Amino acid sequence: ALFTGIIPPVSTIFTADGQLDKPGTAALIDDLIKAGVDGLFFLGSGGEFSQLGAEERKAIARFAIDHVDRRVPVLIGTGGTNARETIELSQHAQQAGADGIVVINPYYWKVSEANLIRYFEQVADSVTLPVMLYNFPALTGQDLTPALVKTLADSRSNIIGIKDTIDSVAHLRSMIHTVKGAHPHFTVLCGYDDHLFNTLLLGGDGAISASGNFAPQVSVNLLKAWRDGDVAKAAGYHQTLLQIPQMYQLDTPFVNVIKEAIVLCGRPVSTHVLPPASPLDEPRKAQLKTLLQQLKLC
Amino acid sequence: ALFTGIIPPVSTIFTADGQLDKPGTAALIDDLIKAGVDGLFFLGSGGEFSQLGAEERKAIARFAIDHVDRRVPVLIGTGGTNARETIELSQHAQQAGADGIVVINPYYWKVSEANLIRYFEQVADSVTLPVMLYNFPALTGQDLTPALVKTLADSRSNIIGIKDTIDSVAHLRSMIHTVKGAHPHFTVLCGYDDHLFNTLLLGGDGAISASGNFAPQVSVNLLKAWRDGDVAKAAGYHQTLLQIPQMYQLDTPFVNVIKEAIVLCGRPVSTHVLPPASPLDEPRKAQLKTLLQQLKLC
Amino acid sequence: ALFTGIIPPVSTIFTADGQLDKPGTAALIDDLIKAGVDGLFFLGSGGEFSQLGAEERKAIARFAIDHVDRRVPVLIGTGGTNARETIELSQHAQQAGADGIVVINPYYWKVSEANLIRYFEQVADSVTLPVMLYNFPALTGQDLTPALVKTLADSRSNIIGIKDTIDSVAHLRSMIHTVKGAHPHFTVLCGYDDHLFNTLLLGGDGAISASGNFAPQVSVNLLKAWRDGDVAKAAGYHQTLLQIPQMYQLDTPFVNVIKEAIVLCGRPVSTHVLPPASPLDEPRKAQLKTLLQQLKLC
Amino acid sequence: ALFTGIIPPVSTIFTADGQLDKPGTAALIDDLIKAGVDGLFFLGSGGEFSQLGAEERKAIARFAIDHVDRRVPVLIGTGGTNARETIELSQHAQQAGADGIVVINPYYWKVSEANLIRYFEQVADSVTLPVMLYNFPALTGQDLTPALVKTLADSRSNIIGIKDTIDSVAHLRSMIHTVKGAHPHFTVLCGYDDHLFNTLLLGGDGAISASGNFAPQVSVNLLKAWRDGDVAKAAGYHQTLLQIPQMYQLDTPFVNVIKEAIVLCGRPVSTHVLPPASPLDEPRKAQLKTLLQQLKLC
């Protein structure tokens, strides 16, 4: 099973003029690796892929892969609506040394099932890298159903997992039973912090979730506890994880909130975010702080 | 009132290797102008803006505007999820000679109302061109409500209309009452063929709809009949427009169907569409042809 | 084709203690018959079926059929969630002299397709009367799709029409092509005022819509004009019908709005509605009046 | 805090002619009480309220309250669309000796917020019994949001809890923060088996869930372990609860499944269900059996 465990969707740190902030992104990467994460995911939703141009995304990916320098597995999010660009970004990720790509379904047009299968097959065929699918139906408007994901894993042996970002036990349970039932080493990762624990108990493989940026230790230690068979300890971590997503209501998009939390939790990076997101206002920053303090995270 | 009447969302004609087909796109543009349309809208949904890169979009807009050569007003669709790219595409449109830009709401993240207002304001402030809003909630997952549109038209004097793409009489009626009630010259255009007649009877201003590519005469003659007070004639065109959208069920996306209909209706252009769309298969092309024959369109 | 033309969903007039108001309901029935409607529909949504007990519904239907005294065809809405009660109400309708029953899908549980087909087949088999389906997905949360309605019409020869209450030209168009294409005399009636014209132009059969209560002459004259081939005149009535549904935004449920409009349009019936609906407040009644005045309806 | 802990939504056992099976319903009640449940809830969605007439529901409720004979607190489901009937059923519950009522929002019309509050205020005013609200937005089409529920708890001192049936950690979390934050003893209960453990860890109070019928011991022992501070033991029960809901996919409605499971788990009751539900077929009964065997439940 590839890409299991705790794999943060790393925030992309930008300077005040919206350029890649290399020292801050580097320091964040180093923080997370030192926290004991099982891999790093660049250019996910939290990484602001959808607010970035293709050349910017290539620059960020190359920078990130190079800085990680093989210390942990690296995933690059290469998806979007422009399928020709997805191939280009995916081939580029492979050339630059990524260990895998994560590919959402096209989220403007909700393409017919035949076009959607064809799309993922074509992307998968464009690289020799492992491909993780990315389901986020609240944003895409089109669910990657367990049956379809199983069909995609039957069709291409390099389609080897899914980040399933959805507040639904049922969807995770059914993703696991359907796809892992036919493909035992297919990887199932939840995209929300407060689903990590259930995803493990259900027989899935970990999480790619926002709190990996600012409190990776909670997920890392939950996974470690769980793997040690200390379920009670794991449940204790889960109890923090259950509360964390309160903070994501502070704004939409909440990429600003995540970066503000990285600062409050002890890593001073620029919190600039790209339009149409915007800076978090002071009242909400203090709110975020009180939440982090209540959870003993800063 | 700016940009009223029948303004097709012009198909972008591509060669087999996916490049701008300049002779074919020119020929289509000339066809529509000589059919009597009131304006031309490039790089809408039907123009495949979301499957194109930014440089590609710039080249297509420049070519298109240049070929129209001021014979009719030209709109350029500049929207996306990358707000910095929206500004750059909009400023480019303006420098390239466009008459207006058409801006959809960001369709990945459904940004908070505050961010959404700020986004459109920023875009409007980046140009001195008129700005048309674009509502397509089936695709975007976020409705531009009549109240929100009113608030945008109240905030910025260059936000002067909307393409409201929705199968909903209520939405069109409410957009008209709420926005045109406060701003008599704000332009309301429907984005669907079969809502043109109702839009006119409701006090709105016309349509930007797919059949403008392959049967502009139906909409052009409907509008003329309407303005002439020949309601019965208008209704007869309406009856054809009511039936046309059957064909869009043949695939999703249906940009392929639109281009196949351009060919069937007398204009031999390449029908290549960009991934993740795909060629219409021969059985469905034959269906399409039967429909178009039944409607007396070819 | 059975039950075509203009068939109002008649308001049930109650006294202040919530009992059936026989003189008010009789006077309303007689007004509608005198206006030239083609049938009358009791205990639809606008008749408050879902706020009434079964014995009250039986009393209402009995009274209504008896007062109509075969002057026009009579439909009784017999639907709900309690399927045994639907059979009872539908058998009672038949015994009481109704010309047909209107049956919505169960709207609590959204029952599986097999359960749904079996439900309708069992209801249809409990009576020898014609059965009109009723689709109101905004309220039911489960659409009767054209394919499913075709399947029901293919299964039972007494399932002979549908009231399709949905603000969607596509749904109406497709209901007509799919069902009427297989069953030319299957009846298609829209449930919204502003879709009657389009329904007629699309090849469907008329409307069962709230304004039949207070302005039946609009729909009646529209249908007559249409049948006479005077399309311009029909479109002129359509223009009024396009504007009427503004008033339904005044409250939810808007049964109160409809009875307040019957009064304002010149028939003084009691406007009591059953909980959880409530009386329309005076400022909104005055807005209603202004509306009706602007439309030349009172 | 009232009605905390494990409170099954009890199946109503019917004979083959669809009458109340008193010996079977009595035996099931006695099994649940013996299993250590903290209360019993009759005529919830699982008790088939929506397929029963009012007099039927009165007779069931009276039978049930009588048979419980005050051994544990008894809740009666008195909701529906007929608001006058809700008051009648609720006053009847009170007279018959119930300890509280559980009241869903009206689920045909989605009544305005003003009408909704008024509805719940009027039912709460009709009885001196504690009222539990019942949120089931997948069926009702109208969410009882934490803000609204807080407004209801501020308005009436006998509105003292909620059954929150939704597959959503966020909703449960926010219900708890918002309502219990203002009303510490307001009761929050989840309606799904696989949310019990999270509900407890979030600060809620228990569950009313389907598996309380055929495996009450899992929930009872999870609650006991949690209250004992034996989190690891609670998590082990949770793991069973995570898997149980697979069986509810077997049919819709799945009231048949729950009753088949009561049989398989050792209590021979008639499994008859009311239309429009229908008997579970043998293949699916066997599937249920294999699931229950895998979970060590039969």
UniProtKB/Swiss-Prot annotation, chains A, B, C, D:
It catalyses: 2-dehydro-3-deoxy-D-gluconate = D-glyceraldehyde + pyruvate; 2-dehydro-3-deoxy-D-arabinonate = glycolaldehyde + pyruvate. Disruption phenotype: Disruption mutant has reduced ability to catabolize D-xylonic acid. YjhH-yagE double mutant cannot use D-xylonate as the sole source of carbon. SUPFAM superfamilies: Aldolase (SSF51569). It holds the Pfam family DHDPS. Its main location: cytoplasm. The keyword Heme does not apply. One of its GO terms (biological process) is aldonic acid catabolic process. Its EC number is 4.1.2.51, 4.1.2.28. Part of prophage CP4-6. PANTHER family: 2-DEHYDRO-3-DEOXY-D-GLUCONATE ALDOLASE YAGE-RELATED, DIHYDRODIPICOLINATE SYNTHASE. This is Putative 2-dehydro-3-deoxy-D-gluconate aldolase YagE. The gene is yagE.
